[PDB]
Structures are given as structure tokens and as C-alpha cells.
Amino acid sequence: MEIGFTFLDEIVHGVRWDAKYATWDNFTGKPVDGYEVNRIVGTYELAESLLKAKELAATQGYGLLLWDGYRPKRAVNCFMQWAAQPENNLTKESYYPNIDRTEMISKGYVASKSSHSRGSAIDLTLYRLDTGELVPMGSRFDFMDERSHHAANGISCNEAQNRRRLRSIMENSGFEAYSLEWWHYVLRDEPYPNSYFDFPVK
């Protein structure tokens, strides 16, 4: 494991995760290059502040489900290569109806360069601690639609409020949200801005 980085579960202990890109259940339909392990890797400072976020989901009995933390530059290239491929319609319905692969970059949904490669960005939801069920957010992880925006309409009052609660837990825990994706959060004062790493999630 690279220096300054860690598997986030080794710091944030009861945390739920599903490394979507080490899995076939992502918009490319296969595991993404650079993700060799079904784990969420991150900067220690990301882990530290995620731990505060995990604890602050005391703001109700909310638990965190992590989907993606540190993302290798080669993972970002793999997404770009995928966006340049012909449409096989394999993941279009679930991940990007209403736009196409091309537009998924034009519209700020897939980054040429990603904050994730700096090791301090995280993708996550909340689940109910009591009930153990996923907190409904109106759109799926990597949904790639205006529906996924924090400010989006066509999302119920609960779903919009739920996104607001995730956002508030994150903002109160040293993170900055991102308008276009309710799941994306970057550590506010991150150890390595301007550094985009490429060691594998391994």
C-alpha cells in the first residue's frame, strides 16, 4: 500500500462498502483498470474525516456505504476509453438514459482528470442504522443525469431531504459537496491537491 494512503475500512471500522469499480456493477460493465481489490482506498486524512462523518451519522441512525475513494489515473483513462467506445446499450438504461457516453464527459459527470486520483474524494450514501436499509436518494450511484444533481427536482421531498442530510453530514465533517452528483464529496483541505496518483487499488 502506497504511503499516506490506507484501505478506508481499516480506519473507519463498521463502514459498509462496495467498490463498484472493482466489480462488474458499474457503468463500464466490467472491473475498471487499476482496481484490483474490492476495497475503498483513501488518503489517511480522508479516512480520518470519514470517521468523523461516520460518527456524526448520529444525525440520525445513519451508517455510511462507500462506493469509491482513491481512483488510479489509469481508472480515469479506462473510463475515458469506455466513453469513446460504441454504444452496446449494456449499461445505458441504468446509468445514462437521456444523455450518451460523450455527453457524460461534456457535462462534468466523468472527469478527464479526477479529484479521486488525489486520494481525498469519496463516493457514498447513507443507510438506516435501525432498519439496515438504504436511505433512498432518488437516483443510483453513477446515475449521470440531472436527477443526480443535489439541487434536482423530480426527486421526492424525502429523497431531496435525504441528499441534504448526507451533504450536511459530510460538510460538517470537513468535506465539500459537488452539485452535480449527490454522492461526491472531497475533503476540504486535502493533503495532495495537484497530485494525481496512479498506484493500483491493491
Q: How many CA atoms lie within 13 A of 141 on its CB side?
A: 22
149 is in an annotated binding site: no
Judged by CB under 5 A, the residue of 5, 184, 190, 197 near Zn ion is 184
| 145 contacts Zn ion (rule: CB under 5 A) | no
Residue (27 or 58) nearer to Zn ion, CB: 27
What dihedral angle (degrees, nearest 10) is formed by the CA atoms of 84, 36, 6, 74?
-30
Task: Please choose, out of 6-14, 45-53, 123-131, 194-202, the segment that lies near Zn ion by the rule CB under 5 A.
Answer: 123-131
Q: How many CA atoms lie within 13 A of 110 on its CB side?
A: 27
| 167 contacts Zn ion (rule: CB under 5 A) | no
| 190 contacts Zn ion (rule: CB under 5 A) | no
Residue (101 or 116) nearer to Zn ion, CB: 116
Task: Please choose, out of 49-57, 58-66, 149-157, 176-184, the segment that lies near Zn ion by the rule CB under 5 A.
Answer: 176-184
3-62: contacts with Zn ion (CB under 5 A): none
Give the Cα-Cα-Cα angle 4, 5, 11 (nearest 5 degrees). Answer: 110
Query: Which cell goes with 199?
Result: 498506484
Could you give the CA distance from residue 164 to residue 194 in angstroms, rounded to a whole number?
Answer: 29
Question: Quick check: is 159 catalytic?
Answer: no
Shortest Å distance, C-beta 75 to Zn ion: 12
Task: Please choose, out of 16-24, 76-84, 121-129, 156-164, the segment that lies near Zn ion by the rule CB under 5 A.
Answer: 121-129
Query: Which cell goes with 2?
Result: 502506497
Residue (123 or 190) nearer to Zn ion, CB: 123
| 123 contacts Zn ion (rule: CB under 5 A) | yes
Residue (20 or 184) nearer to Zn ion, CB: 184
Could you give the CA distance from residue 137 to residue 7 in angstroms, rounded to a whole number?
Answer: 26
Helix residue ranges, H only, the chain: 44-56, 73-83, 92-95, 103-106, 157-171
Residue with cell 453530514: 169
From 2, 159, 181, 190, the catalytic residue? 181
Q: Can you tell me whether residue 186 is helix, strand or coil?
A: strand
| Binding residues for Zn ion (CB under 5 A) | 123, 184
Active site residues per annotation? 181
List residues forming the annotated binding site. Answer: 116, 123, 184
Known binding-site positions for Zn(2+): 116, 123, 184
